[PDB]
Ligand binder design. Sequence first.
Ligand code: HEC
Length: 104
Amino acid sequence: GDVEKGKKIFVQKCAQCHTVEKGGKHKTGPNLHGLFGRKTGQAAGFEYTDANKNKGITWGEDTLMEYLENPKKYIPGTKMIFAGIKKKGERADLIAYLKKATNE
Ligand code: HEC
């Protein structure tokens, strides 16, 4: 995917609730640094729902593609209030940006 387009999507749809930088603050949602290859619910010091904590999948391109299409369908009971990104291209670009930004 396109990292620059993904950053624009992230700022538009995600950044109000999430930081990506190493040591970045929790906001409404957890800091996302180090997400790739990590199980659900593992950001230190964030109070996850039992639903997010117990989902038990590993974050990566495949699981983010499914989650971000419809978060509540993938993790029923999640307190992430976000309807989803319908378009495959937009999700792919956003995920390309997250793979770069959350590993810097
Ligand atoms: C605030 C209104 C949110 C918006 C907009 C987005 N996210 Fe979110 N997210 C938020 C909360 C409160 C939580 C915790 C959910 C819970 O039930 O405890 C989350 C969770 C995520 C996760 C999972 C993190 C993990 O398992 O460690 C991811 C990967 C995530 N959120 C990504 C994400 C993206 C990419 C967004 C823009 C499309 C986005 N979120 C919007 C709050 C909010």
